[PDB]
Design a protein around this nucleic acid. Structure first.
Ligand SMILES: [Mg+2]
Ligand SMILES: [Zn+2]
Ligand SMILES: [Zn+2]
Ligand SMILES: [Zn+2]
Lengths: 53, 45, 53, 158, 971, 63, 108
DNA sequence: CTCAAGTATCGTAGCCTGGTCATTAC
DNA sequence: GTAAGCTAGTATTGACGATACTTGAG
RNA sequence: AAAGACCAGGC
């Protein structure tokens, strides 16, 4: 068996076909702000803290 | 040069008339048209 | 452009596989699209618009 | 005059009385017009842009696939703003004959507004509709006057 | 021995190994091949000898000897070429074998008598021994008739090895093979207000039963009512017997005196239409109860029949209903081919005698026997019945049924698999049946109660279960080995009473009695579990009727079960992967029929039902083997509504696009479709682990979100991803074949012009390989000589690239040509899709990747469906599959940090033993996801965090064969 | 037939990872550990390798 | 045939249209753009102080075209607010590029 | 010397569009 | 000429409306 | 040509 061919490679963008996209995955995420009220954290026994975590 | 092959052995017959459809070296009755040499263009899409 | 294919795969399978192989593209910001190039007809190797494989 | 069968899909961003027609359907169906005054230049523009499919002056049907004098029949292709009427094949659909205004697209389906599913009792799981194309001018008047959506807005069963 | 110490996971592993051994040993088409093999090995000779000898008299007698069949060959040259089924497919030939019989005529040579079609992979097929001509996906079981593949649908008939009690005139009936063997006892009024009396309809002659009692040899009325054995009381029974006595005395004058009743039945039989060529004594020894020896035994059997009728009368016995499958036999290829061959064998003999009778009157001048017998009668009749579908009626003569032979479908390998495993109840007017369209509880384990058509054939066509087997006829005698277990003879005195003893019946024939019945049955069953009784022998103990029934005939539905009391013999063995024969030979497994299973307590598959309480005699291998092959592989299939499971397992899996074949270069089908990259599912049911096949599933694993998308997925529409489609998801190849023929005037040629459009044609009239043919071109050029041609043109939507051109010829001088065209399709905006739970829909929008809403790793969906589809269709299993699959493709984050992080992963979802939702949600929690199955996503067009959480996960989706560009029409 | 060049959903190159995955399976790894050692992190990329059916070997015999 | 992506026809790239019912109000119609340009121009116009309305809209989600509507006060005009938003976006992008090149040269 | 009636039959019982095949020589 | 060898000869899944016949008795 | 026979999609 045999394969024999000639190809022409050009320039394009990913909006045209996904073969021209340079990104396998680009993403972002929001940065979070976490507050824990320690005056209500003392009210919990530690097995309930493990149950929360 | 349109030539045919035998689907059982592989002997390359050359039919140009319409007598019968049969091989010589086997006797079986199935033949394929051979792919000659030419370039076909495709998009890679 | 396929000259000989004796494999058990068909030509659109092979062309779609070839379309998705990543090439080294640092020239892509400096070359032009093939709709804009007047220095050629496509159909071969030509700088600013085409590479032959 | 002509009829057409196609799979339906939805489109919520066009108007309620609008129907989207595939280009393969649209460029092979014709509408007939009688050329006369107030439309010599407007039809001449069309025949110059090769948008009229066929012609008949008198009776001998000469093809165009010629300048215009007043009094013959031009057969042009379906374009935006024409009127067709729609019907799902009336197995139970006894009163579903609706008149709609045409826009053309490139896909393979017929697009309708999602508010028109319950007047047709159709859904988008493989249903096909038949579109019919009125050729005579009195038929166009009857279709536009009895079966439009604003005419048929208040139901006659309830 | 307790079974607790064996443990539950050991027993589950043994159940999986045992089912794997079943599928290795039997396969899925053994019920077709075994029946055809029995017909070739035994039933052919039985036809040709049961037909009998004959003598033409205007004397010359002929006798048929033994019958031989040889392998299918070709006589193209005077060489003998091997004939394979793919030759028969491509040359439009029928794949058949020659039958020879050696006759003996006296007023002796071997004569060819016909060609019989050969079932692929049977004992006559030349492919039984990566051979040239075979597909890897293929099993046998079909026929190649005139180049087309056909299958038999199994036909259901009533069981005629038992008595049938009606109630319309209160009848009880005995049937047999011969139409002169029918025997009816009726309880009715042949007339004020007559008492109901007993009548016999034998040989189309109404006889009182008391006359037949004294004709068979009974001496007294007291011993005749001993032969009936009333069980006392029941004044209606005493009234009917004294009315039948004093009505017997009102017809013959003193029938009790010597040979008066026998002379009466002489003059009553002989006066009928078409009387039999016999005296009455030979009439009784021939046509009355064949299989019994003495007239004493026939009187005893008549008394038992009358007892059965009187017991049904008083309400102690039930009437037979024909929906209970213990009253039914199933007819496959041998039973149908025997019936078809008897007709054309009689038609051959009939036109043999009236051709010989001229030349015999005309002196000897007798020819060789090959002249007087035409062989094309049988050959043409069998092939006509295969190619038209009209078989013979089971009992009506000169009639023809129609739902017998079907076409074999090759859309995927699963459609071919389920086309070979069907069963049919044919009815007269479709639309007024009884409970024929419904599941009966005697279908359990042998026919699927979930999958069936929904058109006119709803419920009338059934599918075999996975572990279901059709029995075959036992050729060794079995009646003489029944005495070794405690059975005694049936004596000949008609004076001795037999109270307390149970009657034994072998295929309906009374052959003996037994005193202890709870030792006879338990010893026969123990001798069957040690391989000195046949494995397909059904033993049923009947406490209310005081009876032991034994069946050894063909057509019964069997299934394997574990034998609990022999189940301790695994511990001491070695857990090397078993053969099925070794597990049968040690009594761990048994084959059990429908009637024997009524005496069985079977634990529900679950070993936890078996080992928590031992009041059981058997146990199932798995509960999901109660379903057919396309229904047992469905995940969470007992979590969906039944109409949806019917949609998936009967309709949508036959229309999916997946695997097609592994040798497409010799397949000239009309349409062939195939995915570019077929995948298997992520989940693992028990049936898929046991069969080890990948071609049961045809589709892709698409990531599905449940969300609204700008109103584009309403009314069961879906939205797909553009970039997932461009990378090759759901990309399909399609090959269509265009065929034409000529005689060997019209011929193949270039047509010398451009009347259509001729660009790619060569001189032979066919294009070149790799040409790009367009709609309006000429694909096959049949130039009629000197013009006026009839070529074949592509229609208004038929495109493609030429893949191959095949030229074939026939044996009777006819040429064929086939041209194949290749197309490649990605989904367009009206293509049809469905999940594995019956949620079909159309593609309504193709969205760009960067417009989709995304997760914190960048995963976007491939398919978006609407949340209004779930509260209304009742398919919750689709949410449970997607939550299970997401748990088994994610990495385990190793909060423990041990070695075996992927050891306790749940991936089965087997029907009737699904995992609970706490296991699925704990698996999602160990992978770092919320238990509810949803996750936060960012909006793709604006970037904002969306307020609602979205359900996402992988579902196995299927691309169906209904495509938008094939539905466009214009008049 | 053969393994696809890129993952369908994200577009990561996976087409040079099949024989490595078979070699790791042959040395008695679980499927999760054979995908962990090979660099695949998103479950979209892992289901491309867990669910691939390798039909090219059967096509090579039957011609 | 896959050529009608970013090239417009003989139309202008941007076409201005000053509406008649409300004063200091206009609608700029931009060819061959989508959510990318329209969303940042909209959220930059809201940062301005003489802008009372800013909003963008695709006329149809399958068209590559947007319409941007601005209503200003009398201290400015729609065209000034449009151009001020675009110039501010260029200067922000230049600042971002200098910061990113510094960080990339720092990491090595 | 005719109504009713107790059978005695007749005949339709889902229906419509699609695509397909395979159609006795005597 | 096929009538569907003769083929049974009632001896096995349909079941109602709709029309047509051989009684007694005013 | 015309009918049979099958299958599919709806109602
Ligand atoms: Mg629908
Ligand atoms: Zn040969
Ligand atoms: Zn150039
Ligand atoms: Zn991925």
């Amino acid at each position: 068996q045999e394969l024999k061919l000639r190809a022409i490679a050009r320039k394009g963008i990913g909006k045209d076909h996904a073969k021209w996209s340079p990104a396998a995955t680009v993403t972002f995420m929001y940065e979070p702000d976490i507050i824990i009220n320690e005056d209500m954290m003392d009210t919990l026994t530690d097995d309930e803290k493990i149950d929360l975590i | 040069p349109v030539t045919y092959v035998c689907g059982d052995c592989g002997q390359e017959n050359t039919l140009k008339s319409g007598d019968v459809i049969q091989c010589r070296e086997c006797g079986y009755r199935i033949l394929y048209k051979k792919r000659t040499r030419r370039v076909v263009q495709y998009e890679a899409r | 452009e396929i000259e000989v294919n004796s494999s058990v795969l068909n030509d659109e399978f092979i062309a779609h596989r070839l379309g998705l192989i990543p090439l080294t593209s640092e020239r892509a910001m400096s070359m032009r699209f093939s709709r804009d190039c007047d220095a050629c007809d496509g159909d071969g190797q030509c700088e600013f618009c085409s590479v032959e494989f | 005059g002509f009829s057409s069968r196609s799979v339906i899909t939805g489109d919520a961003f066009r108007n309620v009385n609008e129907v989207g027609i595939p280009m393969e359907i649209a460029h092979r169906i014709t509408f007939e017009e009688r050329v006369s005054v107030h439309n010599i230049g407007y039809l001449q523009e069309l025949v110059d842009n090769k948008m009229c499919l066929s012609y008949t002056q008198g009776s001998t049907t000469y093809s165009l696939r010629t300048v215009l004098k007043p009094g013959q029949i031009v057969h042009r292709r379906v374009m935006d703003g024409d009127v067709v009427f729609i019907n799902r094949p009336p197995t139970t659909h006894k009163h579903s004959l609706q008149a709609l205004r045409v826009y053309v697209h490139e896909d393979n389906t017929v697009k309708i507004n999602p508010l028109m599913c319950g007047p047709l009792s159709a859904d988008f799981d493989g249903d096909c509709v038949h579109l019919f194309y009125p050729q005579s001018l009195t038929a166009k008047a009857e279709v536009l006057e009895l079966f439009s959506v604003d005419k048929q807005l208040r139901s006659s069963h309830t | 021995v307790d079974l607790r110490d064996l443990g539950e996971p050991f027993l589950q592993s043994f159940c999986k190994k045992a089912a794997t051994s079943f599928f290795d040993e039997y396969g899925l088409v053994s019920h077709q091949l075994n029946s055809y093999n029995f017909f070739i090995e035994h039933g052919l000779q039985s036809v040709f000898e049961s037909s009998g000898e004959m003598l033409v008299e205007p004397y010359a007698t002929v006798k048929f000897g033994e019958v031989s069949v040889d392998k299918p060959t070709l006589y193209s040259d005077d060489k003998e070429l091997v004939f394979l089924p793919w030759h028969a497919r491509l040359q439009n030939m029928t794949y058949s074998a020659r039958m020879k019989v050696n006759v003996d005529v006296e007023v002796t040579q071997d004569i060819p008598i016909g060609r019989i079609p050969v079932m692929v992979k049977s004992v006559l097929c030349n492919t039984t021994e990566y051979r040239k001509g075979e597909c890897a996906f293929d099993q046998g079981g079909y026929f190649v008739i005139k180049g087309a593949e056909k299958v038999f649908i199994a036909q259901e008939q009533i069981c005629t090895k038992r008595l049938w009690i009606s109630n319309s005139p209160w009848t009880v009936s005995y049937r047999s093979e011969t139409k002169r063997n029918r025997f009816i006892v009726r309880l009715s009024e042949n007339q004020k207000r007559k008492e109901k009396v007993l009548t016999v309809y034998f040989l189309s002659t109404e006889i009182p039963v008391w006359v037949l009692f004294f004709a068979l040899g009974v001496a007294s009325d007291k011993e005749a009512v001993d032969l009936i054995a009333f069980d006392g009381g029941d004044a209606s029974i005493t009234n009917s017997v004294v009315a039948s006595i004093q009505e017997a005395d009102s017809v013959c004058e003193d029938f009790r005196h010597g040979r008066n009743a026998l002379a009466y039945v002489e003059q009553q039989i002989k006066g009928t239409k078409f009387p039999p060529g016999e005296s009455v004594d030979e009439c009784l020894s021939l046509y009355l109860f064949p299989g019994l020896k003495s007239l004493t035994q026939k009187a005893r059997f008549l008394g038992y029949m009358v007892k059965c009728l009187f017991s049904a009368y008083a309400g102690k016995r039930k009437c037979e209903n024909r929906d209970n499958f213990r009253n039914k036999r199933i007819e496959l290829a041998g039973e149908l081919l025997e019936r078809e061959l008897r007709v054309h064998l009689a038609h051959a003999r009939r036109t043999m005698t009236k051709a010989m009778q001229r030349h015999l009157t005309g002196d000897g001048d007798l020819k060789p026997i090959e002249h007087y017998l035409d062989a094309s009668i049988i050959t043409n009749g069998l092939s006509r019945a295969f190619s038209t579908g009209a078989w013979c009626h089971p009992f009506r003569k000169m009639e023809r049924v129609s739902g017998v032979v079907a076409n074999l479908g090759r859309a995927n390998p699963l459609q071919s698999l389920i086309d070979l495993r069907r069963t049919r109840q044919q009815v007269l007017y479709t639309g007024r049946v009884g409970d024929a369209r419904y599941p009966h509880p005697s279908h359990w384990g042998r026919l699927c109660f979930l999958s069936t058509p929904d058109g006119e054939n709803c419920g009338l066509v059934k599918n075999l279960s996975l572990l279901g087997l059709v029995s075959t006829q036992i050729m060794e005698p079995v009646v003489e080995e029944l005495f070794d277990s405690g059975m005694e003879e049936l004596m000949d005195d008609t004076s001795t009473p037999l109270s307390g003893k149970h009657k034994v019946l072998l295929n309906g024939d009374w052959v003996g009695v037994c005193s202890d019945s709870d030792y006879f049955v338990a010893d026969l069953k123990s001798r069957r579990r040690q391989s000195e009784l046949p494995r397909q022998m059904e033993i049923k103990l009947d406490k209310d009727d005081k009876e032991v029934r034994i069946f050894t005939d063909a057509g019964r539905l069997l299934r394997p079960l574990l034998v609990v009391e022999n189940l301790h013999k695994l511990k001491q063995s070695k857990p090397s992967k078993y053969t099925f024969e070794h597990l049968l030979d040690q009594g761990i497994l048994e084959l059990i029929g429908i009637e024997e299973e009524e005496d069985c307590t079977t634990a529900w598959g679950t070993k936890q039902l078996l080992k928590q309480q031992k009041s059981y005699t058997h146990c199932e291998l798995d509960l999901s083997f109660l379903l057919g092959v396309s229904c047992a592989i469905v995940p969470f299939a007992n979590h969906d509504h039944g109409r949806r499971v019917l949609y998936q397992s009967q309709k949508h899996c036959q229309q999916a696009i997946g695997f097609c074949s592994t040798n497409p270069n010799i397949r000239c089908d009309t349409l062939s479709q195939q995915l570019f990259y077929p995948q298997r599912p992520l989940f693992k049911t028990m049936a898929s682990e046991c069969l080890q096949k990948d071609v049961l599933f045809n589709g892709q694993n698409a990531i599905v979100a449940v969300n609204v998308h700008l109103g584009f997925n309403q009314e069961d529409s879906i939205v797909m991803n553009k970039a997932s489609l461009e990378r090759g998801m759901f990309r399909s190849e399609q090959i269509r074949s265009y065929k034409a023929d000529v005689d060997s005037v019209v011929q193949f040629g270039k047509t010398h012009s451009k009347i259509g459009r001729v660009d790619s044609l060569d001189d032979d009239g066919f294009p070149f390989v790799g040409a790009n043919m367009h709609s309006g071109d000429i694909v096959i050029g049949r130039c009629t000589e000197s013009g006026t041609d009839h070529s074949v043109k592509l229609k208004h939507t038929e495109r493609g690239i030429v893949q191959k051109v095949v030229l074939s010829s026939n044996d009777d001088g006819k040429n064929y040509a086939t041209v194949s065209l290749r197309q490649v399709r990605s989904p367009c905006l009206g293509d049809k899709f469905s999940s594995m739970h019956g949620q079909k829909g159309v593609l309504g929008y193709i969205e760009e990747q960067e417009n989709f809403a995304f997760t914190n790793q960048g995963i976007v969906p491939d398919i978006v469906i609407n949340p209004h589809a779930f509260p209304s269709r009742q398919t919750p299993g689709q949410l449970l599959e997607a939550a299970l699959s997401k748990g088994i493709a994610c990495p385990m984050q190793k909060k423990k940090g041990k070695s075996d992080a992927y050891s306790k992963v749940t991936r089965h979802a087997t029907p009737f033993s699904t995992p609970s939702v706490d296991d699925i949600t704990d698996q999602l929690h160990r992978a770092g996801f919320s238990r509810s199955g949803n996750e936060r996503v960012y909006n793709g067009r604006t970037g904002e965090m969306m307020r609602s959480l979205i359900f996402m996960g992988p579902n196995f989706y299927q691309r169906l064969i209904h495509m938008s560009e094939d539905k466009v029409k214009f008049r | 037939m053969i393994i696809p060049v890129r993952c369908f959903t994200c577009g990561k190159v996976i087409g040079n990872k099949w024989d490595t995955y078979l070699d790791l399976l042959q040395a008695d790894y679980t499927e999760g550990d054979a995908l962990d050692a090979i660099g695949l992190v998103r479950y979209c990329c892992r289901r491309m390798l867990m669910t691939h059916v390798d039909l090219i070997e059967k096509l090579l015999n039957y011609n | 045939r896959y050529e009608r992506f970013v090239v417009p026809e003989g139309t202008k790239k941007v076409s201005y249209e000053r509406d008649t019912k409300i004063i200091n109000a206009a609608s700029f119609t931009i060819e061959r753009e989508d959510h990318t340009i329209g969303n940042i121009v909209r959220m930059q116009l809201h940062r301005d102080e003489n802008v009372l309305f800013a909003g963008y809209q695709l006329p149809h989600p399958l068209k590559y075209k947007i319409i941007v509507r601005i209503h200003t006060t009398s201290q400015s005009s729609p065209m000034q607010a449009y151009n001020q938003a675009i110039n501010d976006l260029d200067k922000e992008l230049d600042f971002l590029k200098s910061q990113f090149e510094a960080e990339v040269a720092k990491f090595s």
